Amino acid sequence: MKVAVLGAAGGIGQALALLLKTQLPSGSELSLYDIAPVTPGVAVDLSHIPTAVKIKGFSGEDATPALEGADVVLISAGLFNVNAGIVKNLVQQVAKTCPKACIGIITNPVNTTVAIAAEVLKKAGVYDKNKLFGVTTLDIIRSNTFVAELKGKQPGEVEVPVIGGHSGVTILPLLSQVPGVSFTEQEVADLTKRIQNAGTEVVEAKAGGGSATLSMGQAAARFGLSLVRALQGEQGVVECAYVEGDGQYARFFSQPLLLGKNGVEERKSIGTLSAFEQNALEGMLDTLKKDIALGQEFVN
Ligand SMILES: [Ag+]
Ligand SMILES: [Ag+]
Ligand SMILES: [Ag+]
Ligand SMILES: [Ag+]
Ligand SMILES: [Ag+]
Ligand SMILES: [Ag+]
Ligand SMILES: [Ag+]
């Protein structure tokens, strides 16, 4: 099982490649691609770590050598028009090479970049809605951290469902579904406000030094590993991701997903929502639908 990381020389990409090199199952393969000429040396660097994960790095404007045989493609390359054009170009490159591969978009704005990728794969006639994922895992592990700190739980034993989008008011953590933990109405609003603004927390603390890179690589690594495990045939692998589903709330929407040997095996229901959550859901659907349309019009 081969994972291709497009944009592997950036902050997110290098952290993701390090975690995949050290945590991918034995026998996996890892290919790094980035326009930065350092990328082949990034792979040789990681190649000295003693794990059973073959790794090779590529540069230049042609990513196709890195994409050959890839079963999973994670795109973290990357103002909006520049990043939007980068996502569209790289997804067009994947459609020429590995039309099967599961594709996880990390490049922000995820609410828009996933719609960009979908319209591209459609134009190439290779689009499979069970194989395109918007990586929203950072919202989950942030919610796990904030809930565990507030409620005095072990951070590794808390799992918060997070649905909707990946930006601002479209991030809706379903705090009413955390087992064994109850929240006041003040704690729900406060936690929701911090979870929706957590990206700005990092930008301000970095004093202009950028946004989240290390925790984003950790979240992307968690999702990629779950995908790889499910593609190997492991059962009961459930992760949340921004995907094109039934369109009950929006064309793309983050929800629990049973993963399988072909990507999505079943889109699980979001479950019961509290009054606060159902109101936060319908209050942000307009912004989410506009996020999607922005990506749809960028391609069309
Ligand atoms: Ag392939
Ligand atoms: Ag291929
Ligand atoms: Ag696949
Ligand atoms: Ag797939
Ligand atoms: Ag992210
Ligand atoms: Ag979730
Ligand atoms: Ag989930």
Residue 123, token pair as written in the block: 């134009």
Place of tokens 């028009």: 81
Catalytic residue among 2, 88, 166, 222: 166
Query: Known binder of ligand: residue 284?
Result: no
CB environment 127-165: b (16+ within 10 A), e (fewer): bbebbbbbbbbbbbbbbbbbbbeeeeeeeeebbbbbbbb
Cα 173 to ligand 6 centroid, rounded to whole Å: 7
Query: Known binder of ligand: residue 236?
Result: no
Strands 72-75 and 132-134, by their bridges, are: unpaired
What technique was this entry resolved by? X-ray
Distance CA 10, CA 284 (A): 31
Query: Known binder of ligand: residue 184?
Result: no
Residue 72: nearest ligand to its CA? Answer: 3
What residues sit around ligand 3, an ion, with C-beta below 5 angstroms? Answer: 71, 102
Cα 32 to ligand 6 centroid, rounded to whole Å: 28
Query: Known binder of ligand: residue 81?
Result: no
Residue 47, token pair as written in the block: 């190649």
Place of tokens 């990946």: 166
CB 31 within 8 A of CB 98: no
Dihedrals phi, psi of 180, to nearest 5 degrees: 75, 0
Closest of 30, 26, 27 to residue 221, by C-alpha: 30
My answer on whether omega of the bond before 50 falls inside 30° of 0, hence cis, is: no
Distance CA 199, CA 14 (A): 19
Dihedrals phi, psi of 288, to nearest 5 degrees: -65, -45
Cα 138 to ligand 5 centroid, rounded to whole Å: 6
Reply yes or no on whether 166 is catalytic.
Answer: yes
Cα 91 to ligand 2 centroid, rounded to whole Å: 13
